[PDB]
C-alpha cells in the first residue's frame, strides 16, 4: 500500500482539515463513527482508500491524520463535533498557550515545548504504514502557529523522513479576513524556512475564495465555514487520484514530477470549476467544454493573479464524474485556438489529463450544488509571483520602519532572520522572472 499522513496545523489547518475529512467520509461512504456498512469486504476490497484511512480490528476506519494547535479551542470543537468518534484521541494534540500571531513564538518558544510530542504521534502513525509515501501539511501563512510551528515541523520531518514527499496546503493571507497586522512577516518568515523542505505547495488566497463565494454562491458575507467547504472540494479534487483507482497522479512523487520543473518554483496555481450555488442545482448541467474553459478564467482561480501576464511551465487537468476523453481533447483543442496560453519554450505545450469516474460529492446542507462533472486545473505559472510581490511590498513598508519587529526579537529571534528571509524571497521573485 501507498499510505499518506495528513497533518493539520493551527486554527486554519485544523478547520480546513475538519471540512476535508467530513467530505472524504461522505465520498467513501464512511459514517461519523468510522463504520463502513457497504464494505462487504471484511478484507482487501478497492484498497485505494486505505491510503488515507487505517482499518482498526473493530471494523472502524480511522483517518491517517494528526491535528495540532497551540491552543485547545479549535481542536475541542473537533472533539465535540459530529465526527468526534472518527479520530483517535491521541491524534488530537493541543497546547495550553498560543503563538499570539507571532512566528517566533510559534517556532522558538511554544513550538519547541510541543514538537517532540507531535513527532512521537506522527511516528506512531508512520509505524502503522506498510509503505508511507509522504505527508500532506495544512496550515496558514499569516497565523503564529500556522507559520512558526509548521516551519519547525517541516525541518524535523525532513530530518526524520528525508526521502518522504511533503506536500503543503497553505492559506495565503487576505486583508478582508485578516486578524493580524503582522501577517506579512509571518508569511515571509515561514515561506523562507519551508521552501527547501516542501516538494509542492498549493497556495489558497483567502481573497480569491471569498470573492468566489460572493460571486458564484451569492453569499453576501462568507464565513470560514463557507470558505473551508469550497477549499475542501479543491483539496478533494487534488487528492482524488490518491484515494480512488485512476490513471494520473497515483502517488505524491508524480505531482512533483508533473508540476515542478525547478525545485524552488513549486507553487502550482489551482483553479476549480464549476462552483454553483445549491439553489441553482436544477439548472442546465455544464458541458465538458464549458467547465474546461472556466479553468482559464482568472475569476475562478485559488490565487488572485493573471496567468495572461506570465507563462505556463506545467498544466494538469483533473476531471471528476461523467467525462469522456474525446470531449476533453475537443475542449483542449478549442481552448488552444481561442485563449492566450503561452507556455515556456523549453517545456512541451502538453496538458496532462486525469479522469476519475467518481462524481463530486457535496456536504448535505452545504452552499454547493451537486454537479455531474467537475475539473481541477493545476498549473505551474510564473504569474503566481504577483502574489509574492504583494506580500514583499507589505513586508518592506513595515520593515523599513522596523514596525512590530520587537515582538519577534522579544521571543529570541534575530533581526537578521527578517533580512535573510526577505533576500530569499527576492531570489524567488527573480527565479520566476528569469523563467517568465
Amino acid at each position: 500500500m501507498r499510505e499518506c499522513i495528513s497533518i493539520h496545523v493551527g486554527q486554519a489547518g485544523v478547520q480546513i482539515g475538519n471540512a476535508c475529512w467530513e467530505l472524504y467520509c461522505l465520498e467513501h461512504g464512511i459514517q461519523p463513527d468510522g463504520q463502513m456498512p457497504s464494505d462487504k469486504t471484511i478484507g482487501g476490497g478497492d484498497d485505494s482508500f486505505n491510503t488515507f484511512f487505517s482499518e482498526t480490528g473493530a471494523g472502524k476506519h480511522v483517518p491517517r491524520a494528526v491535528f495540532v494547535d497551540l491552543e485547545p479551542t479549535v481542536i475541542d470543537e473537533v472533539r465535540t463535533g459530529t465526527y468526534r468518534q472518527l479520530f483517535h484521541p491521541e491524534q488530537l494534540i493541543t497546547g495550553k498557550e498560543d503563538a499570539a500571531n507571532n512566528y517566533a513564538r510559534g517556532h522558538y518558544t511554544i513550538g519547541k515545548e510541543i514538537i517532540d510530542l507531535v513527532l512521537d504521534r506522527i511516528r506512531k502513525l508512520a509505524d502503522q504504514c506498510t509503505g508511507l509515501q509522504g505527508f500532506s501539511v495544512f496550515h496558514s501563512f499569516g497565523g503564529g502557529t500556522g507559520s512558526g510551528f509548521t516551519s519547525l515541523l517541516m525541518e524535523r520531518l525532513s530530518v526524520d523522513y528525508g526521502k518522504k514527499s511533503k506536500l503543503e496546503f497553505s492559506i495565503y493571507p487576505a486583508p478582508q479576513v485578516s486578524t493580524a497586522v503582522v501577517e506579512p512577516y509571518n508569511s515571509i518568515l515561514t515561506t523562507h524556512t519551508t521552501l527547501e523542505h516542501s516538494d509542492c505547495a498549493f497556495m489558497v488566497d483567502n481573497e480569491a475564495i471569498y470573492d468566489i463565494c460572493r460571486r458564484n454562491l451569492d453569499i453576501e458575507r462568507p464565513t470560514y465555514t463557507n470558505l473551508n467547504r469550497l477549499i475542501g472540494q479543491i483539496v478533494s479534487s487534488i487528492t482524488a487520484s490518491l484515494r480512488f483507482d485512476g490513471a494520473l497522479n497515483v502517488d505524491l512523487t508524480e505531482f512533483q514530477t508533473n508540476l515542478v520543473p525547478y525545485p524552488r518554483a513549486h507553487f502550482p496555481l489551482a483553479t476549480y470549476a464549476p462552483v454553483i450555488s445549491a439553489e441553482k442545482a436544477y439548472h442546465e448541467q455544464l458541458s465538458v467544454a464549458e467547465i474546461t474553459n472556466a479553468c482559464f478564467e482568472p475569476a475562478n482561480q485559488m490565487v488572485k493573479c493573471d496567468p495572461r501576464h506570465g507563462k505556463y511551465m506545467a498544466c494538469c487537468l483533473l476531471y471528476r464524474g461523467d467525462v469522456v476523453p474525446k470531449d476533453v481533447n475537443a475542449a483542449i483543442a478549442t481552448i488552444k485556438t481561442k485563449r492566450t496560453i503561452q507556455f515556456v519554450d523549453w517545456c512541451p505545450t502538453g496538458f496532462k489529463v486525469g479522469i476519475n469516474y467518481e462524481p463530486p460529492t457535496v456536504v448535505p446542507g452545504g452552499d454547493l450544488a451537486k454537479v455531474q462533472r467537475a475539473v481541477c486545473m493545476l498549473s505551474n505559472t510564473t504569474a503566481i509571483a504577483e502574489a509574492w510581490a504583494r506580500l514583499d511590498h507589505k513586508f518592506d513598508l513595515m520593515y523599513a520602519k522596523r514596525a512590530f519587529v520587537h515582538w519577534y526579537v522579544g521571543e529570541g529571534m534575530e533581526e537578521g532572520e527578517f533580512s535573510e528571509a526577505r533576500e530569499d524571497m527576492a531570489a524567488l521573485e527573480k527565479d520566476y522572472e528569469e523563467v517568465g
Binding site: 486554527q11 494547535d69 491552543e71 485547545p72 479551542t73 479549535v74 475541542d76 470543537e77 465535540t80 495550553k96 498557550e97 498560543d98 503563538a99 499570539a100 500571531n101 507571532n102 513564538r105 503564529g144 493571507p173 486583508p175 478582508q176 479576513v177 485578516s178 486578524t179 493580524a180 497586522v181 503582522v182 501577517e183 506579512p184 471569498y210 463565494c213 460572493r214 453569499i219 453576501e220 458575507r221 462568507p222 464565513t223 470560514y224 463557507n226 507589505k394 513586508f395 513598508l397 513595515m398 523599513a400 520602519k401 514596525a403 512590530f404 520587537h406 515582538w407
Partner: protein, 427 residues
C-alpha cells in the same frame, strides 16, 4: 488551562471590578452563590480563565480585593454578588490613603503590600498555566493610584515573564473628588509606562459626556459611568472568555497591539451605547455597529482619533451576525479612512466575532485602538500638573510623606517624553 488573576485596588477599582464580576458571572450563567444555571456548554468551556472550581461545582472568581480602608469592601460584600468572592481575598487597611499617591505607594500601601502578594501567590500557585494579571484602579486617588502601581511593580519583580494588563480610570475636572488628581495621575502614568504591557485608558470626561450628551442622563452618577466601563471590560475580555476563531490569550493580544514597548495605552470604545435599564427594542445593523464603534462619541478616552493615527486596532463583534458583512464593513472603514491608519504597519486592523451577545443586546461591537491621539489625554493631565507644580501648590501633602520635588520633575518629564514619542510616530 489559561488562567488570569484579577486585582481591584481602591474605591474606584473595587466598584468597577465588582460590576465587571456581576456582568461576566451573568454571561457565564453563574449565580451570586457561585452555582451554574446556564443553558450552553460554551458558558463553561473557558470559565477557568477567570474562575476557580470549588467543592460542590461552585465557581469562585480569581479576584483579589484591595483597599487601604474597609468602607468600599464592606459595600462590595453587601452587594448583589458580594458572597461569590473568596473571603480570604479581601485584603484591607484601616488608615486610608486620603487621595495621596505617596501614602498609597511609600507608606500605608507599603505596610499592606506583602499581605496582598501572599494572596496573589496563593491564587497563582493554583493555576495550571498563568497567562498574567489584570488590575482595575483609578489614577486620581491614593490607593488605586499609589498602591496599585506599587503592586504592579512587585508583581513584575515576582512574575517578570507574565503579562500585566490595567483598566486605568483617568481623572477629569468634570468628575473630580480632589485638586491633587493630576499629581497622582502623572506619578502613576510613569509607573504604567515601565511596568505594564496593556493599559486601557478610561477617561471620566468621556464617560460623563457619553452619559450626558448621548444617553441623555441629566445628572450622571458613578453607577452610570461604571455601567459603561463594565460593558467595555466584558467586550474586551470576550475573546479570552469564549471560544472563537482567535483563541486569544493576553500575550497574543499584546504582541498584536503593541508595536513599541512604551506605546501600550489603548482607547476603548463600545457600540451600541445603552443606559442602565433602557431596553433598545431595535437591534442595530452591522454597518451601524461598525460606524458607531469608530465614532469619537463612542470612545471612552476624551481624544479625537482624527487628530492622530492608529498604530493598531482590535474589533470584537458579539452576537449572531454575517461574518462576511463584518469583514466588508471593516474593510470599507479602512479604505475610506486609510490616512488615519499608519501605512508602515500592514494589516494593523484585526477583527474577531463571538456568537454570545452581552445581556440585553442582540449584537454589540467593542473597539480597542492604539492611536497616537491618546497623547491629548496626557497633554491635558500635564497642563493641569504644571499649573499647580509651578507654584509648588499642595506639594506639602507629599513631602510630608517623604517625597522629593525631584520625583515630580522626573514624572513630568517622562510623561512629556511619552507625548513626544507618540508625536514622532504620528508624523
Amino acid at each position: 488551562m489559561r488562567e488570569i488573576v484579577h486585582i481591584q485596588a481602591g474605591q474606584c477599582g473595587n466598584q468597577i471590578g465588582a460590576k465587571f464580576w456581576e456582568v461576566i458571572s451573568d454571561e457565564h450563567g453563574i449565580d451570586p452563590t457561585g452555582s451554574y444555571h446556564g443553558d450552553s456548554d460554551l458558558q463553561l468551556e473557558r470559565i477557568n480563565v477567570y474562575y476557580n472550581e470549588a467543592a460542590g461545582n461552585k465557581y469562585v472568581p480569581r479576584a483579589i480585593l484591595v483597599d487601604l480602608e474597609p468602607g468600599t469592601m464592606d459595600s462590595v460584600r453587601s452587594g448583589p454578588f458580594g458572597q461569590i468572592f473568596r473571603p480570604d481575598n479581601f485584603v484591607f487597611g484601616q488608615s486610608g490613603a486620603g487621595n495621596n499617591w505617596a501614602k498609597g505607594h511609600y507608606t500605608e500601601g507599603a505596610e499592606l503590600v506583602d499581605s496582598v502578594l501572599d494572596v496573589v501567590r496563593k491564587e497563582s500557585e493554583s493555576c495550571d498555566c498563568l497567562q498574567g494579571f489584570q488590575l482595575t484602579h483609578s489614577l486620581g486617588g491614593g490607593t488605586g493610584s499609589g498602591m496599585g502601581t506599587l503592586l504592579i511593580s512587585k508583581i513584575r519583580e515576582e512574575y517578570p515573564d507574565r503579562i500585566m494588563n490595567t483598566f486605568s480610570v483617568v481623572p477629569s475636572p468634570k468628575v473630580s473628588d480632589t485638586v491633587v488628581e493630576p499629581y497622582n495621575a502623572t506619578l502613576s502614568v510613569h509607573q504604567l509606562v515601565e511596568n505594564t504591557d496593556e493599559t486601557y485608558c478610561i477617561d471620566n470626561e468621556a464617560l460623563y459626556d457619553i452619559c450626558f450628551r448621548t444617553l441623555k442622563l441629566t445628572t450622571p452618577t458613578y453607577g452610570d459611568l461604571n455601567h459603561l466601563v463594565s460593558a467595555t471590560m466584558s467586550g474586551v475580555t470576550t475573546c479570552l472568555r469564549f471560544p472563537g476563531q482567535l483563541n486569544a490569550d493576553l500575550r497574543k493580544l499584546a504582541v498584536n497591539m503593541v508595536p513599541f514597548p512604551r506605546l501600550h495605552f489603548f482607547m476603548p470604545g463600545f457600540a451600541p451605547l445603552t443606559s442602565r435599564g433602557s431596553q433598545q427594542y431595535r437591534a442595530l445593523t452591522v454597518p451601524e455597529l461598525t460606524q458607531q464603534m469608530f465614532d469619537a462619541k463612542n470612545m471612552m478616552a476624551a481624544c479625537d482619533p482624527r487628530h492622530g493615527r492608529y498604530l493598531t486596532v482590535a474589533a470584537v463583534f458579539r452576537g449572531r451576525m454575517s461574518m462576511k458583512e463584518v469583514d466588508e464593513q471593516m474593510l470599507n472603514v479602512q479604505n475610506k479612512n486609510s490616512s488615519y491608519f499608519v501605512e508602515w504597519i500592514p494589516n494593523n486592523v484585526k477583527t474577531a466575532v463571538c456568537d454570545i451577545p452581552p445581556r440585553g443586546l442582540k449584537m454589540s461591537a467593542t473597539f480597542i485602538g492604539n492611536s497616537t491621539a491618546i497623547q491629548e489625554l496626557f497633554k491635558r493631565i500635564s497642563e493641569q500638573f504644571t499649573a499647580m507644580f509651578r507654584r509648588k501648590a499642595f506639594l506639602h501633602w507629599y513631602t510630608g510623606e517623604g517625597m522629593d520635588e525631584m520625583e515630580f520633575t522626573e514624572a513630568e518629564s517622562n510623561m512629556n517624553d511619552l507625548v513626544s514619542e507618540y508625536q514622532q510616530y504620528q508624523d
